[PDB]
Amino acid sequence: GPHSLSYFYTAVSRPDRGDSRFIAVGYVDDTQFVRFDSDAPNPREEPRAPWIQQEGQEYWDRETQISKDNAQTYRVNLNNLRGYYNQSEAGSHTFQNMYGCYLGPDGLLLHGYHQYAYDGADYIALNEDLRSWTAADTAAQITKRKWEASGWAEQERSYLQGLCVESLREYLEMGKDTLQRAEPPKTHVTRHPSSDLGVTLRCWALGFYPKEISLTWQREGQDQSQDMELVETRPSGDGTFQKWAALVVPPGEEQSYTCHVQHEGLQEPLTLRWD
Amino acid sequence: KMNTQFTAV
Amino acid sequence: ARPPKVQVYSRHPAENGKPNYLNCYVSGFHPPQIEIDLLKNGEKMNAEQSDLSFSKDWSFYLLVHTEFTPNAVDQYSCRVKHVTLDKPKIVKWDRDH
C-alpha cells in the first residue's frame, strides 16, 4: 500500500538534571533511517540506514539544526504542560509527537497527519484539512487557541504537502532496492509433542518485509484463531521481521491442519502442513 | 526531512 | 502506565555451533524509562540497544541485540526492569520460540 515518511519525537523532563531529553527518529514505511538524541555535548542528526548515508553535509546540517531547535521547543512544552495540569516539579513527564505523509498514486500527498500525547494520553491533532486542530482535553483547548493565533498550521500544511512528500520520494529512490521490494517470508512448521494428549504445531514466517502479514491455522479449512497463540510481529535485526502462530492438536491428527501464510512478497499465499 | 516546530503548547 | 511485553529469540533458526544473532524485543510499555539486559548464564552481556521509538498507540518499543553462537549448554535470557513491574521480568530464550 501507500508509502509513508514519519517521524516520532519523544521528550522527557528530567527534574534531577535540571533539563529535558529529546529523541527523534525517522522512518520510511517500516524502516528506521535517522535519529537524534539531545543527551550529548555536541548532538548531530545521524544516519540509521545504509542508504541515507550518501546525503551531503547540507542535509545533515539542516536536520541537526531542526533537532536542536526542537529540543528547545519541547523543553518549553514540558514546562507549559506541567503548568496546565498544575503538576509537581518533582516528577518526570513525557510528551510525544508523531507526524508524517503518505504518498498517493499521482505522487502527491494522499494523507498527512500530525499529533501529540502527554504521559501517553492523546493531547492534540491536526485535522484532515491540515489547517486546523482538534483538542482531546482542556489544556489542549488552550493550546489550540494559541496555535490558531500563531497560524503555524498553514506552514505544517505546506510541509506535509511539499517537503514531506518530496523527501519521501527521494528516500524511496535512494533505498529502492529494499524500500520498494517486498521480501517474502521464509517459512516452516515445527512440531513439539507437548502433552500426553497434545502436539504443538508452530508455523513460522522469518525475514519478511514489510511488516504486514497474515498467519492463520485451519482444521480442514475451518479457521482456528480462537485457539491459536499468535506472537506480536518482531524485528529480525536486519531490517526484516518475524512472526509465528502455534496451536495444540490431538495426537495423530496433524494431517487435519494447515497454516496459511499471506504476505505481499509471495508469488502466491502458502498453505503449509506438518508433513 | 523533518518539519520545523517552534510554537510551544 | 503500561507494562512491557518481552520476546527473546534468534534471528535465524538456531543450530548449535552456527553464528547467529540473539534479540530481546520489548514493546507496549509507557513511560519510556526501562532497563533491558540480555544475560548469558545469568551474567549481563554487552549488547546494542535500538533508538527509542513508539507505535501508533504511543507505547514504546526497543530491540536489544547481539551476535551469539548458540550451543547445547549456554543459557540465555532477557531481564527487564520497568516501574510497572514489581520484580524484574526474566524471559528465558529457547530455540523453539
Q: Amino acid identity, residue A107?
A: G
Nine-digit cell string for A144: 489550540
Q: Angle formed by the axes of helices A57-84 and A138-150, to 10°?
A: 130
**Which residues of C are less than 8 Å from A238 in CB distance?**
11, 21
CATH number of C30's domain: 2.60.40.10
**Which residues of C are less than 8 Å from A234 in CB distance?**
7, 9, 23, 25
Which of A63, A140, A143 is nearest residue B2 as measured by Cβ atoms? A63
Which of A152, A159, A164 is nearest residue B7 as measured by Cβ atoms? A152
Name the domain boundary from A137, A155, A181. Answer: A181
Residues A5 and A117 in one domain: yes
Stated resolution in angstroms: 1.5
Nearest to A168 by CA among A238, A96, A108, A125: A108
Residues A214 and A232 in one domain: yes
Residues A152 and A37 in one domain: yes
Q: Give one DSSP letter per residue of C26-92, joined into a string.
A: EEEEBSS--EEEEEETTEE---EEPPPEE-TTS-EEEEEEEEE---SS--EEEEEE-TT-SS-EEEE
Query: Please, which residues bridge with residue A13 across strands?
Result: A20
Which of A9, A65, A70 has the most B C-beta neighbours within 10 Å, making it the best mutation to test the interface with B? Answer: A70
Residues A30 and A143 in one domain: yes
* Chain C adjacent subunits, 3+ CB pairs under 8 A: A
CATH number of A76's domain: 3.30.500.10
CA distances from C22 to A143, A203, C83 (A): 45, 20, 25
The residue range of the domain holding A97 is 1-181
Residue A129 burial (CB count, 10 A) = 8
CA A52 – CA C81 distance, rounded (Å):
34
Residues A173 and A207 in one domain: no
Residues A119 and A247 in one domain: no
Residues A149 and A186 in one domain: no
Which of B2, B8, B9 is nearest residue A66 as measured by Cβ atoms? B2
Residues A204 and A168 in one domain: no
CA distances from A169 to A239, A243, B4 (A): 20, 30, 19
Yes or no: say if C80 and C88 are a contact pair by the CB < 8 Å rule.
yes
Nearest CA-CA distance, residue C41 and chain A, Å:
22
The three-state secondary structure class of A33 is strand
CB–CB of A77 and B8 under 8 A? yes
Name the domain boundary from A141, A163, A181. Answer: A181
Q: Do chains B and C touch (3 or more CB pairs under 8 A)?
A: no
Residues A145 and A212 in one domain: no
Residues A140 and A215 in one domain: no
CA diameter of chain C? 41
Which of A38, A44, A59, A73 has the most B C-beta neighbours within 10 Å, making it the best mutation to test the interface with B? Answer: A73
Q: Please give the tally of structural domains in chain C.
A: 1
CB–CB of A80 and B8 under 8 A? yes
Name the domain boundary from A162, A181, A200. Answer: A181
CB–CB of C23 and A236 under 8 A? yes
The residue range of the domain holding C57 is 1-97
| A130 φψ region: left (φ > 0), alpha (ψ -120 to 50), beta (else) | left
CA A41 – CA A23 distance, rounded (Å):
14
Angle at A128 between CA A127 and CA A129, to 5 degrees: 95
Nearest CA-CA distance, residue A33 and chain C, Å:
11
Report the C-alpha dihedral over residues A83, A88, A93, A96, rounded to 10 degrees: -10
CATH number of A195's domain: 2.60.40.10
Q: Please give the tally of structural domains in chain A.
A: 2
CA A5 – CA A29 distance, rounded (Å):
6
Within 8 A by CB and 6+ apart from B7, the residues are A73, A146, A147, A150, A152
Q: Hey, CA dihedral for A54, A60, A62, A68, is it positive or negative?
A: positive
Residue A209 burial (CB count, 10 A) = 24
Residues A12 and A130 in one domain: yes
DSSP β-ladder status, C60-68 and C48-49? antiparallel
Q: Do chains B and A touch (3 or more CB pairs under 8 A)?
A: yes
Q: Amino acid identity, residue A225?
A: S
Residue A110 CB-density burial (10 A; 0-12 exposed, 13-18 middle, 19+ buried) = middle
Within 8 A by CB and 6+ apart from A24, the residues are A7, A8, A9, A10, A35, A36, A67, A70, B2
Which of A10, A48, A192 is nearest residue C52 as measured by Cβ atoms? A10
Within 8 A by CB and 6+ apart from A235, the residues are A241, A242, C23, C25, C63
Residues A197 and A159 in one domain: no
Whether the bond between A184 and the residue before it is cis, its omega within 30 degrees of 0, is no
The three-state secondary structure class of A216 is strand
